[PDB]
Amino acid sequence: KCKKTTTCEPLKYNICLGSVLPYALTSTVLAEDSSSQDEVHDKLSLWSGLRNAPRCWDAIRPLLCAVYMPKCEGGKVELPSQGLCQTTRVPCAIVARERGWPDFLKCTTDYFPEGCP
Ligand SMILES: CC1=C2C[C@H]3[C@@H](CC=C4C[C@@H](O)CC[C@@]43C)[C@@H]2CC[C@]12O[C@@H]1C[C@H](C)CN[C@H]1[C@H]2C
Secondary structure (H helix, E strand, O other): OOEEEOOOEEOOOOEEOOEEOOOOEEOOOOOOOOOOHHHHHHHHHHHHHHOOOHHHHHHHHHHHHHHHOOEEEOOEEEOOOHHHHHOOOOOOHHHHHHOOOOHHHOOOOOOOOOOOO
């Protein structure tokens, strides 16, 4: 569905690349490059190397937050939508040409299901 069974843990940080998150629990299961919130914070630091291109940086940040620090509640996590995923393809093409999107950040419907509420 638009949710995935997981383990909820309390957010280590209330902040995701400049934005305050209106929830308290999260999970790392969507970010398949991170096995803890420490590594999540690490990989987000690396993602911050993109803020020299405000074009992509303004687009990719909701995506990064939705994937790396998603809202968890009752053993499930909110999955990022196809709509959100698609909006980053063009303005963040620099990511694709210089190293390439990780598989969990590519716009397949398994990671980013269409028609989410
Ligand atoms: C910021 C940046 C990126 C960090 C991203 C990478 C996509 C995938 C991952 C995997 C993820 O686990 C960690 C973050 C990482 C490495 C993306 C590629 C483009 C760029 O790398 C260039 C380096 C260059 C020196 C300057 N310009 C830099 C930027 C255009």
